[PDB]
Each structure stands twice: as structure tokens, then as C-alpha cells.
């Protein structure tokens, strides 16, 4: 269901592997909508790790199919993602999501 | 022209017969020239009122607004009055007069002549209220 469309700077080899803290300076976007989040404004590029069910698994499956230094535009299916009711007050249901991502992964 | 031409206006103050004298000569040729003479003079003669543009002479001329005589004017020069507020004195008065001051008025004589011109402007405003 997850489908990547990568702008490919970076090495394109070092995938973020398990037991590792991947750090993405990201920003979201909605399907024919507008923004709802950005690490860029807050100046804390989202230091989290993989396989822990912290983020939704659409973002994790995107995190698996990437590398260091690259740049992708990550579609996100609602049943994979929040969308059966959505994050209330912030996201409605059936939310098909989009994410810009730029990262280093110090493991 | 700042030092002089005001005695002409003082002669124009009294002697309404002189206002008649203007009429025969004009219709021989009424917003007469006689009252309308010093207009450029009133523009440029009171450049160096005081500190060139300061207009403490404004308050002084406010003091002279009683048809005050010459001895009264000399007494009022003996009195003295000025202000240095941070209001619109700054840009118009001080920050254009002292930059404009090629030779700034620094004497009681300058304030004396300034308030004499202020009494002259009081008589001129009396004459202008006569015209309008």
C-alpha cells in the first residue's frame, strides 16, 4: 500500500535498520489539502527510533524503504495510518497523508 | 528687507485716508497692493526668528497679542520666554533651524528684533482679519 517516489541525493545505500534512532526533519501534507505539522518550524527534527510503534506504520514502512541523505514524498493509506476516525480535532477520517522527509540516521 | 519694510506696514495700519489714496490711483490704472505688499516678505524675512526656526517667538508673539506698543515690546523682551519640548519643535523648529543656522541668533538683541517682528505680525494679522 505504501508507495515511494524518491528524490535521490545521498548515498542511497545505508537504509535505517532495526534498533536505530532515525532523525528526520520532516513536514506533512494532506491529499488535496494543506499542512498540519512541521519539524522545521519547531527546530526539533524528531529524534525517534524504528520498530517501536511510536509513529504510525505507514511512516515506518516509508522509513524502511529509504537511505541516508535522500528525499522522498511518502504517501500514506488511512487504514495503515490514523484514518478510521483520525486524530480528533486535527485530522478527519479516511485521511490519505503525504510527508516530505529529509534525514540523517545516527544509529 | 527683514530689517526694513515694516514701517511701511505700520503707516498702512493707521491713516484710512491712505486706503482712500490707494483707490484713486488704482481706478486711475479692492484687494490693494498696499496690504498685499509684504507676502514674500512675510515668507522670507522671518526665517531667523530665533534659533533659526525654533519659534519661542511663537509664544512671544502670543505675549504680544494685545496691540502692544514699542515700550511694551521692550519690556516683554526684558521678560523673556522660551521652551525646548520634545514635541514638534524638533523637526520643524530645531532640527531644521540649527541645521539651517548658518549663523544662529545668539543675543537678546536677536530676540528683541524677533518679537518686534512678532508685534508686526500681530498688526498684520489685525489687518488680515480686517481683510478676512
Amino acid at each position: 500500500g505504501v508507495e515511494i517516489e524518491t528524490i535521490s541525493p545521498g548515498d542511497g545505500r545505508t537504509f535505517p535498520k532495526k534498533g536505530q534512532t532515525c532523525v528526520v526533519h520532516y513536514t506533512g501534507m494532506l491529499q488535496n489539502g494543506k499542512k498540519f505539522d512541521s519539524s522545521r518550524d519547531r527546530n526539533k527534527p524528531f529524534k525517534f527510533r524504528i520498530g517501536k510503534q511510536e509513529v504510525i506504520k505507514g511512516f515506518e514502512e516509508g522509513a524502511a524503504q529509504m537511505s541516508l541523505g535522500q528525499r522522498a514524498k511518502l504517501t500514506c493509506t488511512p487504514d495503515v495510518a490514523y484514518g478510521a476516525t483520525g486524530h480528533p480535532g486535527v485530522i478527519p477520517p479516511n485521511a490519505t497523508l503525504i510527508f516530505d522527509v529529509e534525514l540523517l540516521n545516527l544509529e | 528687507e527683514i530689517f526694513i519694510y515694516w514701517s511701511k506696514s505700520h503707516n498702512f495700519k493707521r491713516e484710512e485716508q491712505n486706503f482712500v489714496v490707494q483707490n484713486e490711483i488704482n481706478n486711475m490704472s479692492v484687494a490693494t497692493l498696499k496690504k498685499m505688499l509684504p507676502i514674500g516678505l512675510n515668507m522670507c524675512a522671518p526665517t531667523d526668528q530665533d534659533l533659526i526656526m525654533l519659534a519661542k517667538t511663537r509664544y512671544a508673539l502670543k505675549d504680544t497679542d494685545e496691540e502692544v506698543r514699542e515700550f511694551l515690546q521692550n519690556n516683554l523682551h526684558l521678560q523673556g520666554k522660551v521652551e525646548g519640548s520634545p514635541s514638534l519643535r524638533w523637526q520643524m523648529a530645531l532640527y531644521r533651524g540649527l541645521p539651517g543656522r548658518e549663523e544662529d541668533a545668539d543675543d537678546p538683541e536677536k530676540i528683541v528684533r524677533r518679537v518686534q517682528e512678532v508685534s508686526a505680525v500681530l498688526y498684520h494679522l489685525e489687518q488680515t482679519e480686517h481683510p478676512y
Partner: protein, 843 residues
């Protein structure tokens, strides 16, 4: 429903002064090649995704109006139909960015290049990633305009184009048969960057706001000659005319040193025509005969009355003196007549200039039009070149003189500038100072705050101004006052609300009227305070200063400094916003106060739906241009849900009003011009199980059917505004992915469809969608009466008209920004914050 926000970087673009299009005639090969070189390190700025893309524009983009646009921000390019754009996986037009494939799908990295292969025959455009081809193109688009070199760009980027002329270091070849700037590029000018709609520039002392510029020959790029019975006396005198001009070119030959011999040769520099007009060879006799006749063929279409006038200058014919050094081996002496005295006038020398332009245009006809001389050419004779213009003029200037020696006697809008309302002034004595750079049409004064745009300055009560272009004033029309301007020309402008007076001053002296009245606008009522104002016609410049500092005032030593009149922005720490006038036609609701456009919320009865009926003062009022009327509620399709738009007059009609299958928030709308009838109406109806708009009418043709959110053309025609089509491809161009997109007015021409000649009523039936009814239109916008299948008309609905112009605000700040192909800089950042309506979809 509500007001969202975020921060956006100030979008910008640039343009070299190069203009290429299509017309029935001269085109200058219509095929040109692009090279550019980038050096940036900023794919992401501080804030957001940095922006760069490239394309073309047909002199109607005007996306520079830096602020808001239809999307979020008044963004760069490929954000309309009159301009295109591209940055790697893209087909930009109208904030529609559907992507394409190419080798190496990566975007505008530094040390990267591109070209642009412009075709116009079957008009199609592609580009080329640095060396590799793009498998996706634009094609099937309009051409009423010249197509520019454009790059839209955001902050912190440096870049350089390369030209071909002098330092175009072309890595890359042109595409097949393409032109890097040889034939005629700035043929009466030079090369320079020229960012479009640049209504301001960074000035030396104060910033030089400017007005628009005339469209530089989108059409009229082709010149034209003048397209016959010669009188017999002209046929007679033609021999004398031919002989005199032959003597004259014998002079210009031998002044170089071109004597006569019967052989043509270069080193001895002969020219074997140097004989009498009759001794010349027979084809060359016909040639000189035809020139001596065709000067008259140019002269006949002038409303003259020709004839041997006097026969008194004929015997007065005196021949000028020429010594034997000008006698030559021919024996045919050049012997021109002496015309020291023969002066016609200053006027009909312009007739000779018209003949010269016709000469250059028949040159175009011979060489370029039918010949198409594939080698080094000329250009449109209206603006081809000053030198050949004057040469071709003075060549024939002597023909009319020689005849008179023979006695043959013969004979798009204004930009407006205002401060905002917060700085409105009510009392006291105030001064500001405008400076006039040009001396064309511009007008300056004080004015009321509610200056409606779309009207000339001073045409109503809301202004009191001076027009020193002509030495006029202006108040509900022109009136005469004061001398006019020349260039430079500091004009001071003053006002005294204590006494209801107006004071213009011109370089340190009070202006006067015909009556000797001291700038008479007397007994001006106070009103709503007052506001300074300026304006500028096309090709007009002049900056000013509001007394933000007193030293910057050029004069201010005459009329106010001793006399109470005050600098306007005296006690501030910041300038005024300086609101200005628009050009784009945004929709706006119906003012109920209108003279001859009046509506009626028709309440639905049992046997009818509700409706909206227009009313017009069918009288001497203005039955003006075709006013496109729009509604309030939008309709984004899901993601489809119709799979098409389809129309029925009273039955199945020309179908396939274009399907799109995305959001595409559309609005119902329609062309309409007044027939001096009531006017066509707007109903709302379910057919039986599907919504059908029904625009009832009686009168005549008024072209209704749906139009998108991005609709903004003024007038000039109900049809022929949409042009942009998908051209996606694959590696072998096998991509069968296309669709005739950009349905700005995906609607019915309608005048050809019914009713050749009659006057019954007429209705139309578009498609809504098909849903679970087992219906209306109103249900599918308010989303609460969605299941509610009846038709309604809530008060949120209010119909619109595009005005041509409204007002808008100047930002208080602007961007910062050049050789070896005219490089360009950008280092400093800038941004703002922005609102945006979702129902309207504009920022």
C-alpha cells in the same frame, strides 16, 4: 470554512527582454534555444521548500504581484494558463503539477542546465534535463502573445543564463533548426533583464514606482505595404523623374568612384547601368521605369490633386554646377536639378516615411514572406531600424521635390497609488512632495479615502488633483490651471483643512490659475479626512517622499516650513503601506446599489423552484461588455462522481464538457450581455433524479455553462481563452497519457446550437452527479442538506461579477536581486504570512 495560515517565501521571477510568438508573416525563424547554469546550496531554506522552475509566458501571466494568488501565495510561473513551468517531474499550469518521467528523476540541483525546444507549427514545447530528454511535453495551446525566457525563483539562489551572441558558452547544441540570437534580437534596442509587471524598482534615493508598459507587438509583429490608375501626365513626367534619379545615383556612384564601363566588375568598380534611361538595357529599363512609376503608385493613395500646375517654375528650372571631375567616361553627365528652394513642408515628409515603411514591407514580402531567404535578415518596418528607416525615407524624399520642381503639386490601463486609511488626515496643514521622472500622463493630489478603482483620477467628487502633463487641474473632469511639467520637476503638494484650501507647488513656487487664483479648490468640505494619492499611465515613472525625513525633501524651503504646513510622515518610525490598484479581475458580489444591474432572490413556489432574476435599466444606461457572473458556493469533485460534464438545451446536446476526476472546485457561471430585455435568470432544479441547472431566458445569446475557480479574463470575447493540454510520454515516447485539460470555461458557445432566428424562451440542462436518491443541485455544497434532496437557495449564496480591478497592498519590503551571460544574484531571504479561503481558493 475558516481562516487558515502559514508562512510563505516571497515568490519572484525574471525575464530577459526576448519576445517570440507567431503571426501571419514575419516570425524570425520562431525556434530558439535555452542555456542556463545554476549555483545554489539551498534546496530547503530556513522555512520551507525552496522553489525554482522554468517555462514560458504569453505576456498575460503577470504572476508577479508579490503577495497572494489562487493557490497559497502569488506564486511564480506555471500558475495560470498564460504561462508554463517545469522543475523536473512536472507540467505546471494553474497550480496543477501532475508529473512526468525522464532519465534521472531528480530536481534542480546546482551545476545543472536545461534547454527549451519551442515549436509553433504544431505548437508543442518540451525541455531537456541536463543532457537527457524529457518524456512529457506541452502542446495544443494558444499563441496570442510572445513567449518569454522566464525562470521563477525563491531566495538564496544564484544562476546565470547564456545567450549565444557574445559569451554564450553553449555546452549543448540547439535543437534541430533553432536560433541563438542572430537575425533580429532587440533590432532597435539591446539586451537586458526585464521582470514582468515590475511596478517598482530600487531607486537611487527614493524608490521609483512605475506604471505598466504597452504590449510590445504581440500582434503587429508583421509590417504591411499599401495596396492604381496613373494619370498620363504622370506617365509623361516619369521619364524626367527617372532621368533625374539616374543622374543622382550616378553622383553617388562616382563620389565613391564608380564610373561607367559596359562591363560589371568590382576592382575597376564599374556598374554598367551608368547610361541614359533609354540607353539602359531593356530589363533594366523596365526596372528604372518601374521605380519611377512606383514612387507615384505610392503617392497616388494620399488624397492629392496632381497636374502640371504653373509652367512658371519650368522655365525657372536652373541646373546646378558640376565641374569636369564629375564628368566621366560615360559621357552621360550626372546633371541633377538644383532644388535649394524646393521645400514642401515638415508634414508630408512623414508621407515619405510611410512610403519607406511600405518599401521595407515589400522587401519583407519579396525576401522573407514568399522567399524565406534561409540566411542572414530584416524585421517589421514599424520598428525595424532607425538607420534603414531614414535611409529609405531620404532616398524618396527627393522624388517629390523633383516633382514640385516640375510643378506637380501634391498633398492598457492606469496604475493608481494611495496610502492606507490609518494615516488619513483630518485637520492641520500638511505637505508631501512628488517628483516627476517622465512627463507623460500622471496625476497627483489629495483625495478622499474611498477612491473606487476602474475610473480615471478626478472623474468624480472623490479627488482634487493637478495634471501638469498639460497644465490642467482635474475635478469631475479636467480644468485648466498652472503650467505643465518638464522632466525632473519637483512638485510639492499641500493642503489646509483649517480653511478648506489646496496648494500645489512646482519646484519651489506656488502655481497659479488663469484668474491668478492661488490654486483654487476652495470650500472643500471635510468629509472622512483626506489622503494623498498618485497615479501613472503606461510607461510612466515618478517617486515621492512623505516627509519620512525632512532632509530628503528636495526643496521644502518656500511655502510650508515657515508657514505651518507639515511633513506627512514626520513623527513615525516606519513608512505607509501604500496601497495600489490591481489589474486581475477577481470576482466580487453584486452591490445592491447598482444603477442598471439588479437581482431578485425569487422564492420557490409549489410548481417551480426558486430562482435569481436579473433586472437591467433597459434605457439609456450602459448595456456594456459581457459581464461574466459567478456564484458563491464551490464544488470540488471527489478524490469521478460524474465522469464528465454534459449539457442539454432541452435534450441531449454537444456532450463531453471535460471530465477531470480530481477536486477541481468549479462554479456555475455564464457570459451575459444586455439585450435591453429583463435578462436571463438562474434557477436551481432537480431533473428527476439528477441536478440540472436551468438558466431561464427570453432575449438572445448569452453563453452559459460552468466555469472554474481560476476564471479571470475581462472581456473581448466569450470563447477562445482556454489553451493547455497534457503531453506525457515514455522513453520511446510510448506514454499514451493525455487529456485536454484546463477547462477554465468548460461551457457552451451556445449561439450556434439553437435558434437561428426567433424569440421564444430558452433553457439549458447541465449535469450535477448521480447519488442515492431512490437529485438537487444545492445538496452537494452545504454538506448538511446532502441527503436532503430538495432544491434550496441559502443566503450564503450571492452572485458575483468580476470587476476588472480592485485594490491591494504593497509590501513594505522586497528582494535584493551580472555578466558572462547576464548572471543574477539572490542571497537574502524574505517571507510573510498569508490567509486563504478554501471556498474561493485564493490567498
Amino acid at each position: 470554512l475558516l481562516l487558515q495560515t502559514n508562512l510563505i517565501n516571497y515568490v519572484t521571477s525574471i525575464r530577459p527582454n526576448i519576445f517570440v510568438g507567431r503571426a501571419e508573416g514575419s516570425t524570425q525563424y520562431g525556434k530558439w534555444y535555452f542555456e542556463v547554469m545554476v549555483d545554489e546550496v539551498v534546496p530547503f531554506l530556513t522555512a520551507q521548500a525552496t522553489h525554482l522552475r522554468v517555462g514560458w509566458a504569453l505576456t498575460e501571466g503577470y504572476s508577479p504581484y508579490p503577495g497572494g494568488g489562487e493557490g497559497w501565495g502569488g506564486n511564480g510561473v506555471g500558475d495560470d494558463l498564460y504561462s508554463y513551468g517545469f522543475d523536473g517531474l512536472h507540467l505546471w499550469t494553474g497550480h496543477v503539477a501532475r508529473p512526468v518521467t525522464s532519465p534521472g528523476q531528480h530536481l534542480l540541483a546546482p551545476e545543472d542546465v536545461v534547454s527549451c525546444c519551442l515549436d509553433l507549427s504544431v505548437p508543442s514545447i518540451s525541455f531537456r534535463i541536463n543532457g537527457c530528454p524529457v518524456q512529457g511535453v506541452f502542446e495544443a495551446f494558444n499563441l496570442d502573445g510572445l513567449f518569454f525566457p522566464v525562470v521563477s525563483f525563491s531566495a538564496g539562489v544564484k544562476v546565470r543564463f547564456l545567450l549565444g551572441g557574445r559569451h554564450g558558452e553553449f555546452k549543448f547544441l540547439p535543437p534541430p533548426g533553432y536560433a541563438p540570437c542572430h537575425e533580429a534580437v532587440l533590432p532597435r534596442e539591446r539586451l537586458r533583464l526585464e521582470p514582468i509587471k515590475e511596478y517598482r524598482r530600487e531607486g537611487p534615493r527614493g524608490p521609483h514606482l512605475v506604471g505598466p508598459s504597452r504590449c510590445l507587438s504581440h500582434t503587429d509583429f508583421v509590417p504591411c505595404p499599401v495596396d492604381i490608375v496613373l494619370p498620363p501626365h504622370l506617365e509623361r513626367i516619369r521619364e524626367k523623374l527617372a532621368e533625374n534619379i539616374h543622374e543622382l545615383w550616378a553622383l553617388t556612384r562616382i563620389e565613391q568612384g564608380w564610373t561607367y564601363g559596359p562591363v560589371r566588375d568590382d576592382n575597376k568598380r564599374l556598374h554598367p547601368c551608368l547610361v541614359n534611361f533609354h540607353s539602359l538595357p531593356e530589363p533594366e529599363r523596365n526596372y528604372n521605369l518601374q521605380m519611377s512609376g512606383e514612387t507615384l503608385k505610392t503617392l497616388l493613395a494620399l488624397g492629392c490633386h496632381v497636374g502640371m500646375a504653373d509652367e512658371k517654375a519650368e522655365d525657372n528650372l536652373k541646373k546646378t554646377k558640376l565641374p569636369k571631375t564629375y564628368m566621366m567616361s560615360n559621357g552621360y553627365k550626372p546633371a541633377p536639378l538644383d532644388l535649394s528652394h524646393v521645400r514642401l513642408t515638415p508634414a508630408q515628409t512623414t508621407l515619405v516615411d510611410r512610403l519607406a515603411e511600405n518599401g521595407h514591407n515589400v522587401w519583407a514580402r519579396d525576401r522573407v514572406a514568399q522567399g524565406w531567404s534561409y540566411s542572414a535578415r530584416l524585421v517589421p518596418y514599424r520598428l525595424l531600424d532607425e538607420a534603414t528607416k531614414r535611409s529609405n525615407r531620404d532616398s524618396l524624399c527627393q522624388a517629390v521635390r523633383t516633382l514640385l520642381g516640375y510643378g506637380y503639386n501634391i498633398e492598457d490601463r492606469v496604475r493608481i497609488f494611495r496610502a492606507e486609511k490609518s494615516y488619513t488626515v483630518q485637520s492641520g496643514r500638511w505637505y508631501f512632495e512628488f517628483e516627476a521622472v517622465t512627463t507623460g500622463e500622471m496625476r497627483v493630489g489629495w483625495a478622499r479615502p474611498e477612491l473606487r478603482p476602474d475610473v480615471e483620477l478626478g472623474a468624480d467628487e472623490l479627488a482634487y488633483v493637478f495634471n501638469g502633463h498639460r497644465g490642467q487641474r482635474w475635478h469631475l473632469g479636467s480644468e485648466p490651471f498652472g503650467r505643465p511639467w518638464q522632466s525632473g520637476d519637483v512638485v510639492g503638494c499641500m493642503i489646509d483643512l483649517t480653511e478648506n484650501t489646496i496648494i500645489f507647488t512646482l519646484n519651489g513656487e506656488v502655481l497659479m490659475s488663469d484668474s491668478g487664483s492661488e490654486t483654487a479648490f476652495r470650500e472643500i468640505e471635510i468629509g472622512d479626512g483626506f489622503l494623498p494619492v498618485c497615479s501613472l499611465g503606461p510607461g510612466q515613472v515618478g517617486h515621492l517622499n512623505l516627509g519620512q525625513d525632512v532632509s530628503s525633501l528636495r526643496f521644502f524651503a518656500i511655502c510650508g516650513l515657515q508657514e505651518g504646513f507639515e511633513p506627512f510622515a514626520i513623527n513615525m518610525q516606519r513608512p505607509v503601506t501604500t496601497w495600489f490598484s490591481k489589474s486581475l479581475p477577481q470576482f466580487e458580489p453584486v452591490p445592491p446599489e447598482h444603477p442598471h444591474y439588479e437581482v431578485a432572490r425569487m422564492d420557490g413556489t409549489v410548481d417551480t423552484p426558486p430562482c435569481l432574476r436579473l433586472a437591467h435599466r433597459t434605457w439609456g444606461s450602459q448595456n456594456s461588455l459581457v459581464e461574466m457572473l459567478f456564484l458563491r458556493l464551490s464544488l470540488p469533485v471527489q478524490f469521478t462522481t460524474t465522469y464528465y460534464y454534459s449539457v442539454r438545451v432541452f435534450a441531449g446536446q454537444e456532450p463531453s464538457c471535460v471530465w477531470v476526476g480530481w477536486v477541481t472546485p468549479d462554479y456555475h457561471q455564464h457570459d451575459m450581455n444586455f439585450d435591453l430585455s429583463k435578462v436571463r435568470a438562474v434557477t436551481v432544479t432537480m431533473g428527476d433524479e439528477q441536478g440540472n441547472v436551468h438558466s431561464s431566458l427570453k432575449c438572445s445569446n448569452c453563453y452559459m455553462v460552468w466555469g472554474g475557480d481560476f476564471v479571470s479574463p475581462g472581456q473581448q470575447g466569450r470563447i477562445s481563452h482556454t489553451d493547455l493540454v497534457i503531453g506525457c510520454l515514455v522513453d520511446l515516447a510510448t506514454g499514451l497519457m493525455t487529456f485536454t485539460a484546463n477547462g477554465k470555461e468548460s461551457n457552451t458557445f451556445f449561439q450556434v446550437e439553437p435558434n437561428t432566428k426567433l424569440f421564444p424562451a430558452v433553457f439549458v440542462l447541465p449535469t450535477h452527479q448521480n447519488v442515492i436518491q431512490f437529485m438537487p443541485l444545492s445538496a452537494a455544497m452545504f454538506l448538511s442538506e446532502r441527503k436532503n434532496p430538495a432544491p434550496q437557495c441559502p443566503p450564503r449564496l450571492e452572485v458575483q461579477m468580476l470587476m476588472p480591478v480592485s485594490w491591494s497592498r504593497m509590501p513594505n519590503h522586497f528582494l535584493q536581486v551580472e555578466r558572462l551571460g547576464w548572471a543574477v544574484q539572490c542571497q537574502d531571504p524574505l517571507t510573510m504570512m498569508a490567509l486563504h479561503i478554501p471556498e474561493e481558493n485564493r490567498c
